[PDB]
Amino acid sequence: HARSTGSYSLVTQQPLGGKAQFGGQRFGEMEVWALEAYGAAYTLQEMLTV
Amino acid sequence: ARVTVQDAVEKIGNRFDLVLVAARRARQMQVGGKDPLVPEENDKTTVIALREIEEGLINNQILDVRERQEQQEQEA
Amino acid sequence: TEEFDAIKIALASPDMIRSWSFGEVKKPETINYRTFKPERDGLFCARIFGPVKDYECLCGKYKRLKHRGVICEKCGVEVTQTKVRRERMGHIELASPTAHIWFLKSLPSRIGLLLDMPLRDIERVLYFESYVVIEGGMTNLERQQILTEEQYLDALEEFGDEFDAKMGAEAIQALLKSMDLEQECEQLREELNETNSETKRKKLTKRIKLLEAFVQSGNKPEWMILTVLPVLPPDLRPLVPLDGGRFATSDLNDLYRRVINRNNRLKRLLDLAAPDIIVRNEKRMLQEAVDALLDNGRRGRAITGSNKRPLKSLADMIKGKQGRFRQNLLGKRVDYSGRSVITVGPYLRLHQCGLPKKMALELFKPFIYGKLELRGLATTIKAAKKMVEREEAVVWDILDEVIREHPVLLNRAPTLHRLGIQAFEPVLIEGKAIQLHPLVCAAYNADFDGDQMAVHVPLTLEAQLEARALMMSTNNILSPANGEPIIVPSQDVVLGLYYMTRDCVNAKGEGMVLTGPKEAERLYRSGLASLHARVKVRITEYEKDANGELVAKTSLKDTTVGRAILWMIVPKGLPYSIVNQALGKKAISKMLNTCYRILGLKPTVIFADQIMYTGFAYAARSGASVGIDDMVIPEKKHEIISEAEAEVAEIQEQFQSGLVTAGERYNKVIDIWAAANDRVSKAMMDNLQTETVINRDGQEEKQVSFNSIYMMADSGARGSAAQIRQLAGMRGLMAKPDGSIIETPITANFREGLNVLQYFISTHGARKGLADTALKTANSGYLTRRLVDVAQDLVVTEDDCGTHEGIMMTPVIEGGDVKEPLRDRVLGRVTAEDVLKPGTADILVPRNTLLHEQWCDLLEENSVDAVKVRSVVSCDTDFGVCAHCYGRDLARGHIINKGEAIGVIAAQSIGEPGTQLTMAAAESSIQVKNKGSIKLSNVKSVVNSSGKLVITSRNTELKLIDEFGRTKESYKVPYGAVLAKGDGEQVAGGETVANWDPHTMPVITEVSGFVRFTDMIDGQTITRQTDELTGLSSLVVLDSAERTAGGKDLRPALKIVDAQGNDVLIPGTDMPAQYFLPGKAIVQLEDGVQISSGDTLARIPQESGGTKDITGGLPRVADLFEARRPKEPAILAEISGIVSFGKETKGKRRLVITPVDGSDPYEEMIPKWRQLNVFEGERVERGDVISDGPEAPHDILRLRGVHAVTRYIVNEVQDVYRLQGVKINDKHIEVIVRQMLRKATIVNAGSSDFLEGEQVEYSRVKIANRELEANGKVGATYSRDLLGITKASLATESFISAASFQETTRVLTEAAVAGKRDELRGLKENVIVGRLIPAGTGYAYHQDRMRRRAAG
Amino acid sequence: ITRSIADQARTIRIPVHMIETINKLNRISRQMLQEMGREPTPEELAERMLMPEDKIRKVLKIAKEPISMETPIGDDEDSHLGDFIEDTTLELPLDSATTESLRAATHDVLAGLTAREAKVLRMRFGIDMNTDYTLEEVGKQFDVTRERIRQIEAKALRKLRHPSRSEVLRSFLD
Amino acid sequence: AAVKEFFGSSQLSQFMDQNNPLSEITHKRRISALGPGGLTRERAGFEVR
RNA sequence: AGGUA
DNA sequence: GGGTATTCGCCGTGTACCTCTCCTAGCCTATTCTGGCTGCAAAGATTTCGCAAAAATCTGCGG
DNA sequence: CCGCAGATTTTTGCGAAATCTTTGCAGCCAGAATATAATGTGTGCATGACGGCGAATACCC
């Protein structure tokens, strides 16, 4: 499953939904830690906001 | 393609502000206004910035001084 | 576009709640069912929360973008943007004030503690169980007291119109109104200066601190009682149509409907003057409904109709696991991402990965559109969309162009350490699976058995650059937890390398002379020689020498053809000796490490890729296959099995005779089977190891076998000796339920198929292993989460701070031998002291500097025993750590860069190996294994008439000085021992240098004279078991767990007096001449017996060990990081000076230490179940143990100091980890410790309250300020306190971080009542906010913002 | 009690008379179910009531109450129903980019026309200002309130009919 | 209605894993310690496992 | 709910 | 005095997929009159759209 | 290179209809009004991890 645009949510804006085109991949707290471990700041901000 | 950034890290020892300065250089490269200083192989701005920093053409100081001089001809 | 330096949390006021509200929700109506237009004025309302559809009044009046600055005044509905409906809040005017459940049922009840009133009383008042007086009058009734129905009626009858008392939340709110904070603060301040009573002063101090904190919060206590209840915007509690009779509705919607219903009913009842019972019932309704809405679950659950499930509440939506749901997990979904199964990428370069064409097209659709419109192949975005969905060949060149430079992030489904996400250059591949570089799968811990990986696209140019510089695989060739490379050849490539380098004894083309490895490759590929054969080859090796210049040396080496072929690959600059050997996993890893250290990054990456290709190619050419014959059964398996059966049958027969006990019989059988298993394994390994017996020229010789399974065993590709043992030998002993080892082991292996019953036996082991893996994975996840929480905010903020403090750093010796040398523990560390050579006083290490491999080699050459190293814990930096105090470790041999987040990398480093954690001649006679100088540390011994070097106390160590300065064998001498060696005597290896009975600790007298019984009653302290043969007895001093009624009033002791009766003191020992007998000290020598120096006085029975008392793995690591008590804290001597006993057994015996100088009285408690190692009248020092058993981190930090507790934690955790073969740089545990002790307790304040638990950084800046200033107030003194990682993360400076990953409700309540104002400057805080983290790339940005703050 | 069940028990409002109709429908459905012994057929339901049958089915749809999103989809999967609901009130970024490109193209085309024609068109349809003006409103500001203003608009339209300014806008509408 | 609730929507009423004859046989022969009146997944609880 | 790592 | 000695709540619990739609219940339940509300039908008032059409205007080229 | 024809531009005119407010209508809907036999009862309690931990009364010494 791959997406660049598609199903968002109501209460939140996290992209997920659809049996035709699904949401993106959950960038959970583990991956946020992984980025924080490096000097990964702008990539983290992309993961979070944009 | 730039396999390694170690040579760039050699010029800019922090390895974090290296990202900032090369990002500024590459953004001035992509956004219209600045023309390249190193030949390309149909490459985007990123490896251009890496090559420019690697040969010492661009660092924090050159980008800053250049943005001054350009500010002075545009104000005239 | 929004700028804000900090977030304040406080108590919401009814006025500002109305300020948020745009309209009052007066009806529980929602919609018109058939027409889904929201009702007025219901929970969904355009008149209140704004219009439903974009820029049009919900009356059909105005439908245009023109009518947007003016609202519709022709009807209630207003006209704005629809997104406004997602932000507008409402308010409900509660007829009766309602208490907030959070301020009520939290374990510290803020309402309860502010009123200093116990919880049951608030529960009864609020729930209308009893009345409470809201101020009285001139009555005998207190200002505050609860009264029952009849008591309240009696008070009302007795006292007329002077009695103000109500019931419930109205009464609580009235009480909060009647309470004034500032005036009480003034009263307490006046009273404190006047009061001298201890308890009164403590009460005044507690109350004044609480009230002053509440006033500083700027909150009015009445606000804890909700008068107006805010209601969430409807979009955050959506009501969306669904097919059929089912419609998605929020549990919040139903909860607010219930609240509105009950409020309206209360209003109607009040308007109707309903009886008191009914109005009390309806107020109970409102209180219960509000409590469920705020937090359903602390009131006996609330369920709805047509659905049996606890309704979601606001607290339940906030409180989540793991962490906050929407913000971080679960789960913060992301766009521009894909996911697919991974396959091997054996042709790829390290810096690139195979990405399927379809995923590349879907991921980069905006990029494709941009480039198509750039070259003008599409006139609009829609045309580009049609082109890409048609997938014409035109868009594919655009796709190749956009992919060429763009790097993409590859992510494993679980992320244990920072290598779980790595950048690669995508390479377009036809197919559907992501091809992953084989070298990288080790870092991902990903095996190609259906594992799925995700791909993320860094969009912005800064992110592309950031990924190429940091995320890239080639930039992360070294593990962050250890300098040795993480991209190591693993299994197939290792097997190929091993087969290529392993030499035979006879093959084609032996004895040839070759020049260059090129002739070797020519001979091998032409089939004129064999891949491995002893050959002299002329090769030019290059040596990095002089100043970094290559030294070409060309000479002949005796090697093999495969080795020369490999040497062709090896880049110039490495010694040939590295490859002229059999290459296992360890050999290749070491060779890569040497290549990286000597050459650099680019040669290392190129060499790793080339070695991967070579290993794969020569493994394929090897044809290494596992058949059915390559598990050759040892010939002695049947013989050994039959023998062991014979001995176990003999033992069973003897057990029936009653000669041997059941336990001894079981132990003997287990030992017999273990010996049989070892014999079988050894025979199997001898058979497989040297299976080849082929002749070199006619003379047969025994050399390494060509057997394939022995190749995978020896090369360490896959399968160890234990693994092959279950295949070719016999799989041996296992365990049954209850975890006991089975009496009869499995005598079969996997080549001789197991029978039914033995397989059923093995099933238990399989189930236990699988369940253990699952539970240990969950526990490791929780542990690493806690480590991330405590180490979240730590980041390198300074290049250097300047400090000569540090830790004393030595190679560690536990037991009797060294298992971790000095070099590995000190590699990459910075010096704290210019340590001299072990001989001459020469400085070989300059002022504080990074220690790389050359300095470590210099230290090894001049072996210095200890080095002071600047640890992070001793760093003087505040709000961060200096670069030097951390070290160098990352992905480079250079010092850490300023801005790097060491806390997170350390937490990941300690957490990731957590899935790998599934957990005579000792104490009888000390046997030094090698020959070296004997040295005694903290020894108390004097030579007696028998030449016995009897050591007293359990705090003496025996080290082994080597040829220069290094201890290599260390031992612990217990209380009472005999030593025939001196303090400088040389001892041979394996020689018994000390000895004592394994059945008991003997107390050997060092003086002479009659034994006098001091504090003795024959029948209370000692019991009569006189067995006089030569003047002996079996008098038993009762154990120090329980004694008699008269044995608890005396401390039994044996004084040694001469014939004259004068005291004869022991020379050269702190021990007094009056031996204070501890528990079970059997008095062999009776009163009136001449004792010789060298005779036992009282034996302390023991068992020579034989019982396991050591645990490890995840629970041990967690308990160490939580600073848990060991259930028996070994209390230390907490001040130096002479010690003495106190009054005996008030329940717990007291011990008074009075220093020889200074403040004398230091009486303390000791429980009577402890085994004392302290003897009254001896000179002890702060740090010496007082009772045996394990220690707790708290008192270690408190007494022995910060460095000591850091050393203890590091050593203990590293002992657990080295037990499983996992190596972690101790700096990670050091930074975790530094985060654990960030809180301190004030003794003397500067502006504190003399007991305030305060952040050490603020305390340190304040003490620095007062010291530099002429104002030395007060003060100020502090003592560092140690808190568990959960507690440290829970009590941080920012309430966002604490509330995020821990108890959210209680943290939020504490922050609100305290009015906390977190100022960010923390990774997780900025993550939640959604701005650049103050670490790494973002550190430059935040440092800029720091300059913009507090200054123009 | 009936009033309470009608009002405070239904998540969506249902009128009391409608609730009574629902109860009658359910009772007659039970009667027909136990008499025929198979199922309540809509034909007999229509026959018993004065109510046509389409109203019967719409009432049956109404009689069901909304369900929570917190219920798990798939019988206790750790995911909730609301985790799948797509936001239909949000304009897709594809459509937003199309709108931006269309606005740019219309602005360029209006710049390609004369001064007064483009000026009339801007206020006639509200192009690139947050307000819209009527034909007479534009005529009043152009101090010409006659057929002349509509003739100018028609002239602008006819000029746009040429296949040199309509080709760029031709892509947007298929 | 209750019988249909049991047979249709229950912890122990599952879509038949139907991709093999073996899959169907195993599903019909399956023994669950979970369900109404059994053990919740809040276990381990090593004994039963 | 079942299954995957 | 005082030190446990119970009981009494609160809290924490891996990641990330996929298939499934399964989510939903009693029916025991009275009558009605008056008035408004809202969607729709109908009418006065009014602006906005296109052709009409002739008259003025714009542009190509050879004698 | 200039004047008229084709093409393009200028100008006056009538029909059409839609929209905004008002009036009549029908389905929706709310409260007000009438007097059947029925009060200490129901009820859901759904229940088999594991470790930590303070708070809340009890009880020996």
Curated annotation (Swiss-Prot), chain A:
Acetylated on several lysine residues in the presence of glucose. Co-administration of salinamide and rifampicin or salinamide and myxopyronin suppresses the emergence of resistance to both antibiotics. Belongs to the RNA polymerase beta chain family. DNA-dependent RNA polymerase (RNAP) catalyzes the transcription of DNA into RNA using the four ribonucleoside triphosphates as substrates. Resistance to the antibiotics salinamide A, salinamide B, rifampicin, streptolydigin, CBR703, myxopyronin, and lipiarmycin can result from mutations in this protein. The RNAP catalytic core consists of 2 alpha, 1 beta, 1 beta' and 1 omega subunit. When a sigma factor is associated with the core the holoenzyme is formed, which can initiate transcription. The rRNA transcription and antitermination complex (rrnTAC) consists of RNAP, NusA, NusB, NusE (rpsJ), NusG, SubB, ribosomal protein S4, DNA and precursor rRNA; S4 is more flexible than other subunits. In pull-down experiments interacts with CedA. This is DNA-directed RNA polymerase subunit beta.
Curated annotation (Swiss-Prot), chain B:
Promotes RNA polymerase (RNAP) assembly. Latches the N- and C-terminal regions of the beta' subunit thereby facilitating its interaction with the beta and alpha subunits. The chain holds residues 2 to 77 of 91 of the full protein. It catalyses: RNA(n) + a ribonucleoside 5'-triphosphate = RNA(n+1) + diphosphate. The RNAP catalytic core consists of 2 alpha, 1 beta, 1 beta' and 1 omega subunit. When a sigma factor is associated with the core the holoenzyme is formed, which can initiate transcription. The rRNA transcription and antitermination complex (rrnTAC) consists of RNAP, NusA, NusB, NusE (rpsJ), NusG, SubB, ribosomal protein S4, DNA and precursor rRNA; S4 is more flexible than other subunits. GO terms for biological process: bacterial-type flagellum assembly; bacterial-type flagellum-dependent cell motility; cell motility; cellular response to cell envelope stress; DNA-templated transcription initiation; intracellular iron ion homeostasis; nitrate assimilation; protein-containing complex assembly. This is DNA-directed RNA polymerase subunit omega. GO terms for cellular component: cytosol; cytosolic DNA-directed RNA polymerase complex; RNA polymerase complex; transcription elongation factor complex. One of its GO terms (molecular function) is DNA-directed RNA polymerase activity. Its EC number is 2.7.7.6.
Curated annotation (Swiss-Prot), chain C:
Changing A766 to T/V: Resistant to antibiotics salinamide A and B. It catalyses: RNA(n) + a ribonucleoside 5'-triphosphate = RNA(n+1) + diphosphate. Zn(2+) 2 binds at C801, C875, C882, C885. Changing M684V: Resistant to antibiotics salinamide A and B. It is an enzyme of class 2 (transferase). Its EC number is 2.7.7.6. Co-administration of salinamide and rifampicin or salinamide and myxopyronin suppresses the emergence of resistance to both antibiotics. Its cofactor is Mg(2+); Zn(2+). One of its GO terms (molecular function) is zinc ion binding. InterPro entries: DNA-dir_RpoC_beta_prime, DNA-dir_RpoC_beta_prime_bact, RNA_pol_asu, RNA_pol_N, RNA_pol_Rpb1_1, RNA_pol_Rpb1_3, RNA_pol_Rpb1_3_sf, RNA_pol_Rpb1_4. Acetylated on several lysine residues in the presence of glucose. Pfam families: RNA_pol_Rpb1_1 (PF04997), RNA_pol_Rpb1_2 (PF00623), RNA_pol_Rpb1_3 (PF04983), RNA_pol_Rpb1_4 (PF05000), RNA_pol_Rpb1_5 (PF04998). Changing F750C: Resistant to antibiotics salinamide A and B. Mg(2+) binds at D447, D449, D451. One of its GO terms (biological process) is bacterial-type flagellum assembly. One of its GO terms (cellular component) is cytosolic DNA-directed RNA polymerase complex. Keywords: Acetylation, Antibiotic resistance, DNA-directed RNA polymerase, Magnesium, Metal-binding, Nucleotidyltransferase, Transcription, Transferase, Zinc. The modification N6-acetyllysine is found at K959. Binds 1 Mg(2+) ion per subunit. Zn(2+) 1 binds at C57, C59, C72, C75. Changing L770R: Resistant to antibiotics salinamide A and B. Belongs to the RNA polymerase beta' chain family. This is DNA-directed RNA polymerase subunit beta'. It comes from Escherichia coli (strain K12).
UniProtKB/Swiss-Prot annotation, chain D:
Residues 109-162 are annotated as: Sigma-70 factor domain-4. The record marks R124 as: Interaction with anti-sigma factors. Residues 20-96 are annotated as: Sigma-70 factor domain-3. Disulfide bonds: none annotated. It comes from the Bacteria. Residues 135-154 bind DNA. It is found in: Cytoplasm. Residues 146-161 are annotated as: Interaction with anti-sigma factors. Contains 4 domains, connected by flexible linkers. In the active conformation, the domains are in an extended conformation, each making extensive interactions with the RNA polymerase catalytic core. In the autoinhibited state, sigma-70 factor domain-1 packs closely together with sigma-70 factor domains-2 and -4, contrary to the extended conformation that is seen when the protein is part of the RNA polymerase holoenzyme. Belongs to the sigma-70 factor family. RpoD/SigA subfamily. Interacts transiently with the RNA polymerase catalytic core formed by RpoA, RpoB, RpoC and RpoZ (2 alpha, 1 beta, 1 beta' and 1 omega subunit) to form the RNA polymerase holoenzyme that can initiate transcription. Identified in a complex containing RpoD, the RNA polymerase subunits RpoA, RpoB and RpoZ, CRP and DNA. Interacts with Rsd; this prevents interaction with the RNA polymerase catalytic core and with promoter DNA, and as a consequence, promotes transcription from promoters that require alternative sigma factors. (Microbial infection) Interacts with Escherichia phage lambda antitermination protein Q. This is RNA polymerase sigma factor RpoD. It comes from Escherichia coli (strain K12). The chain holds residues 439 to 612 of 613 of the full protein.
